[PDB]
Design a protein around this ligand. Structure first.
Ligand SMILES: [Ca+2]
Lengths: 249, 246
C-alpha cells in the first residue's frame, strides 16, 4: 500500500491537468524516492513528466514500490473535483484502487473520492540523457503569447540562437513572424554554451505551454542543434512538471 | 520604405476593425502629410475615407512622396488581435513586405507580403448637406447599439434642429430625440429633412467610439449620410452611407 498527504491541493490538480495534455489515462508511479508520472503523445513527439520528491510531501509512506493506473474515467472523476482553494489531499492505496480525501483550510470539512484503479509494477525514470547547449528562463505569460503568435502563422516553430538574444520564427510561404527574446526583455535568465537552431511542432509547443496553466513559478526552456526542447517548471509547493519535444530531426 | 509609430494601438486596431467590416482589401496611401485609407464596399452603398495625419504618430518617416500599400483586412486584423495593451505598435515597409511590430514587454513582428489592391476614387467629396449636427461619439454609439438589434432600416429625421433616430422592427420600434437643449447634441443646425439608411452599415461604425471622442453627422433627404469621426490629431474617419429607395 501507499499513504500520502499533500500540503497543496491546488498544485495536485495542476499536475493531473498537465499530464492530460499528452494522455487521457495516467500512470502514477510510487517509488521510494517519490511520485513520478511520464507519458508520451503516441507519435512520440511530446513527453510529459511529473516529478515529486518525498521531502515536499507532508506525509509519504509505502510498503513497496507500486504503480496505479488511472483510466480516462478516473482522471475525469479527479478533475471534476478540482479547485484553487487552499486544501489538503489525503491519498491512500485501497483494494479496488485509490481513496482521495480533500480537506480545505477554511470551513475544515472533507469529501471523499473513491477511485477504481488497477495496480501494477513501477516503471523507472528514463530522463533524456542529453544536456542542452541553450538555456533560458521566463514565465508562462511570455510563452503563451509566443504559442499563439506562431500558431497564427505556421504549423512549425523554428527556434534559433542569436547573439545575446533568442530568435523565434514561423511561416512556410510568405506570411511570417519573428520574436526577439533577450535578457530582461523579458528574460530573467539566459545562458548560451554554444549556437543552436532546432525545429518543433508549433502545436506540440502549444500543448506543452498549455501544460503550464496552473503554475505560478518561472519556467526554464532549453534546446540544442537539431536536438529536443525541454520545458521546465517547479511548482510553488514542491515538484517539477516537465515537457520534452522531439525535434523535426 | 516607411516607418510610423502609434502610441494608442488599441484605438488604432478598432479603426482597422471598422474598415474591415466594409472592405476586404485596401491601400495605405503614405505621404509626408500622413496615411490615407479610402474605398467603396462591394455593395456600392458605403464609401469610407480615413486620414491619419503624421501628428497621429510618434515616429513618422518616408522614402518617397507617395507609397501605395495593398493589404487584406482579415490578415492585418488577425495580426492586430495579438496586441498586448502595453505594446507600442510600429508600421513599417519596404519593396516586398508590410511589417507590424509589437514592442513593449518584448519585441515581436508580423510580416505580410504586399498585394495588388485596385486604387480608389471618391470622386468627389463635396456636395453640401441641408443638416449638420455635432455630438459625442459615445452618445451615438449608445443609441446605435440598442437600435441596431431591432431592425434593418434606420430612419433619421430632423425637426426644428432636433435629431431623431428611428427603427421599426418586427418585434419593436424605438424612436429617440437628440437636442442641444439638454446637451445630447453639442451643436445642431439645418433644415427639416428625412432619410433612411441600412442599419447594418451604420451599426458597423460604432466601434469608432474607441478611437474618436467627438463626431459630426451630416445628411439630407435622398442623399447619403455622412459620419465624421474626429480623431485626436486633426485626423478623421469619414463614412458616407447611401440612402435607401426614396
Ligand atoms: Ca446591441
Amino acid at each position: 500500500m501507499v499513504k500520502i498527504v499533500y500540503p497543496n491541493a491546488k498544485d495536485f490538480f495542476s499536475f493531473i491537468n498537465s499530464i492530460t495534455n499528452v494522455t487521457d489515462s495516467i500512470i502514477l508511479n510510487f517509488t521510494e524516492d517519490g511520485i513520478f508520472s511520464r507519458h508520451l503523445t503516441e507519435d512520440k513527439v511530446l513527453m510529459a513528466i511529473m516529478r515529486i520528491p518525498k521531502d515536499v510531501l507532508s506525509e509519504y509512506s509505502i510498503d513497496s514500490p507500486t504503480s496505479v493506473k488511472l483510466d480516462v474515467s478516473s482522471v475525469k472523476k479527479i478533475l471534476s473535483k478540482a479547485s484553487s482553494k487552499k486544501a489538503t489531499i489525503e491519498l491512500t492505496e485501497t483494494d479496488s484502487g485509490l481513496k482521495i480525501i480533500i480537506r480545505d483550510e477554511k470551513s475544515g470539512a472533507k469529501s471523499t473520492i473513491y477511485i477504481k484503479a488497477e495496480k501494477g509494477q513501477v516503471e523507472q525514470l528514463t530522463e533524456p540523457k542529453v544536456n542542452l547547449a541553450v538555456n533560458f528562463t521566463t514565465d508562462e505569460s511570455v510563452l503563451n503569447v509566443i504559442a499563439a503568435d506562431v500558431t497564427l502563422v505556421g504549423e512549425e516553430m523554428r527556434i534559433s540562437t542569436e547573439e545575446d538574444k533568442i530568435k523565434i520564427e514561423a511561416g512556410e510561404e510568405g506570411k511570417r513572424y519573428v520574436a526577439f527574446l533577450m535578457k530582461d526583455k523579458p528574460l530573467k535568465e539566459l545562458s548560451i554554451d554554444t549556437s543552436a537552431s532546432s525545429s518543433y511542432s508549433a502545436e506540440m509547443f502549444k500543448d506543452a505551454v498549455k501544460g503550464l496553466r496552473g503554475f505560478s513559478a518561472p519556467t526554464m526552456v532549453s534546446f540544442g542543434e537539431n536536438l529536443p526542447m525541454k520545458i521546465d517548471v517547479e511548482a510553488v509547493s514542491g515538484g517539477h512538471m516537465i515537457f520534452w519535444i522531439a525535434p523535426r530531426l | 520604405m516607411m516607418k510610423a509609430k502609434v502610441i494608442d494601438a488599441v484605438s488604432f486596431s478598432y479603426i482597422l476593425r471598422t474598415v474591415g467590416d466594409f472592405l476586404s482589401e485596401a491601400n495605405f496611401i503614405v505621404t509626408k502629410e500622413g496615411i490615407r485609407v479610402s474605398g467603396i464596399d462591394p455593395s456600392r452603398v458605403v464609401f469610407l475615407d480615413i486620414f491619419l495625419p503624421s501628428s497621429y504618430f510618434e515616429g513618422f518617416e518616408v522614402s518617397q512622396e507617395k507609397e501605395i500599400i495593398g493589404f487584406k483586412l482579415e490578415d492585418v486584423n488577425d495580426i492586430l488581435k495579438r496586441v498586448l495593451k502595453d505594446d507600442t505598435l510600429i508600421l513599417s515597409s519596404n519593396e516586398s513586405k508590410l511589417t507590424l511590430t509589437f514592442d513593449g514587454e518584448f519585441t515581436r513582428s508580423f510580416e505580410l507580403p504586399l498585394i495588388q489592391v485596385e486604387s480608389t476614387q471618391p470622386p468627389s467629396v463635396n456636395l453640401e448637406f441641408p443638416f449638420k449636427a455635432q455630438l459625442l461619439t459615445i452618445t451615438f454609439a449608445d443609441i446605435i447599439d440598442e437600435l441596431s438589434d431591432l431592425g434593418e432600416v434606420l430612419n433619421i429625421h430632423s425637426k426644428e434642429n432636433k435629431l431623431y433616430f428611428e427603427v421599426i422592427g418586427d418585434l419593436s420600434t424605438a424612436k429617440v430625440e437628440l437636442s442641444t437643449d439638454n446637451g445630447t447634441l453639442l451643436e445642431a443646425s439645418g433644415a427639416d429633412v428625412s432619410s433612411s439608411y441600412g442599419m447594418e452599415y451604420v451599426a458597423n461604425t460604432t466601434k469608432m467610439r474607441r478611437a474618436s471622442d467627438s463626431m459630426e453627422l451630416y445628411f439630407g433627404s435622398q442623399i447619403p449620410l455622412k459620419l465624421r469621426f474626429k480623431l485626436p490629431q486633426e485626423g478623421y474617419g469619414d463614412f458616407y452611407i447611401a440612402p435607401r429607395a426614396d
